[PDB]
Design an enzyme around this catalytic site. Structure first.
Site, PDB file in Angstrom:
ATOM      1  NE  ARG A 268       7.018   9.175  -0.955  1.00 38.86           N
ATOM      2  CZ  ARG A 268       6.610  10.405  -0.630  1.00 38.86           C
ATOM      3  NH1 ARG A 268       5.426  10.845  -1.016  1.00 38.86           N
ATOM      4  NH2 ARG A 268       7.375  11.175   0.126  1.00 38.86           N
TER       5      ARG A 268
ATOM      6  N   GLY B 134       0.827  -1.226   0.000  1.00 37.95           N
ATOM      7  CA  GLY B 134       0.000   0.000   0.000  1.00 37.95           C
ATOM      8  C   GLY B 134       0.849   1.259   0.000  1.00 37.95           C
TER       9      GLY B 134
ATOM     10  CD  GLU C 116       8.532  15.256 -10.424  1.00 36.59           C
ATOM     11  OE1 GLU C 116       9.493  15.851  -9.898  1.00 36.59           O
ATOM     12  OE2 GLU C 116       8.234  15.340 -11.636  1.00 36.59           O
TER      13      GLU C 116
END
Lengths: 201, 203
Positions: free
Chosen positions: A60, A36, A58
């Site tokens: 992710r 997750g 940036e």
DNA sequence: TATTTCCCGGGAAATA
DNA sequence: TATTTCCCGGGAAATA
């Protein structure tokens, strides 16, 4: 922490746009698919309301773009001591300039309402009568062309160069060619001349 | 013409004008010009539907300056304008927007670079301009104050002032500035006039 | 706050 | 008033 639209986020505007490896992004997206989202991105508000500028994460943000999520967990930053003052400067620099057709509509109304001469209006706005006349001419152009002026896709002189064709179908044709081939006005003027010799044959 | 003092509380912004955004610093800068020399260009207003209440036609910037200075009164010129006249006056002002001078931008760039410890590249990126455009504005700050004023007062263009930089002597520059105005020289001529003066530096 | 070169659309003079 | 012509400063690429 807040969930914000992926479409609302833009990269750090002061830095050059980063280019990531598709494999490194897929490698990160597979870390998100397994464990997750583990660290939310950091953003701030732009001059526009619905829009956020990325500060950190940036990499992710790009991973979740490929995973095709509509929403991304984020941490908003509320800076004033510098940010609000600088945002005032940058906005005072990048002043939103009215397009030709916007001005044309403005001139048209002012001439209708107060029964002014073009000379009179030109005097007040510190422009030449011909400058006022040549803006008002653009109002006869097809609505698609008028939109392209507004959306700043083409320049005033681009739209002016289409007027001689007189046929709305021929104009909208070239409009698309000007955008697709990124033609300057000199080219656009020649492209018209050549089409008025195809009108002869 | 006729000037009258009206309550600052009685004035509201022009209806038809979009809600203006002024910098607190630019307002304070104007308020400090009023506080020092005690002189204001009077605002233009008209009467609203209510009595003792005025609607602003021109001079919203000056009205805001006197709000911060906390004066009870503001010098004003009353005008009997119809909702149409008032709306058109808003249009013509929205058309003839005051565009920032080279020196103004130069000072703005200098501050933005000091504040965020940015590169010229970085700033140019943000403003959607070329690094060289930023550099060449900042260069104007080295020019003599007389030349900087001429840029602000719009007596000469950015390129005019840039063309003076090679004449590294302030006396030679202020000389040409006057010649540019007197002979109404374009930048191409100004560039040549400089070249010729750098052969008089040899002789 | 580095500097030089020079392309090109704004915008107005010339013209109808 | 509407249309044609075309000069020239902004502004950015190149930087002997």
């Amino acid at each position: 922490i807040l969930e914000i639209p992926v479409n609302a986020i833009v990269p750090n505007r002061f830095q050059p746009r980063t280019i990531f490896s598709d494999e490194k992004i897929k490698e990160l997206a597979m870390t998100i698919h397994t464990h997750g989202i583990i660290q939310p991105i950091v953003v701030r508000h732009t001059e526009e309301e619905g829009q956020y500028e990325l500060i950190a994460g940036e990499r992710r943000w790009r991973a979740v773009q490929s995973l095709e999520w509509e929403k991304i967990p984020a941490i908003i930053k509320d800076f004033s001591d510098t940010e609000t003052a600088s945002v005032a400067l940058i906005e005072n620099l990048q002043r939103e300039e009215l397009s030709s057709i916007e001005e044309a509509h403005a001139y048209a109304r002012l001439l209708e309402l107060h029964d002014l001469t073009q000379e009179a209006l030109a005097q007040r706005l510190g422009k030449g009568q011909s400058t006022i006349a040549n803006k008002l001419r653009l109002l006869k152009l097809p609505q698609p062309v008028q939109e392209a002026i507004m959306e700043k896709k083409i320049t005033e002189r681009h739209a002016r160069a289409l007027i001689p064709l007189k046929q709305p179908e021929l104009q909208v044709t070239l409009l698309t060619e000007i955008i697709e081939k990124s033609l300057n006005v000199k080219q656009t003027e020649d492209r018209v001349v050549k089409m008025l010799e195809q009108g002869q044959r």
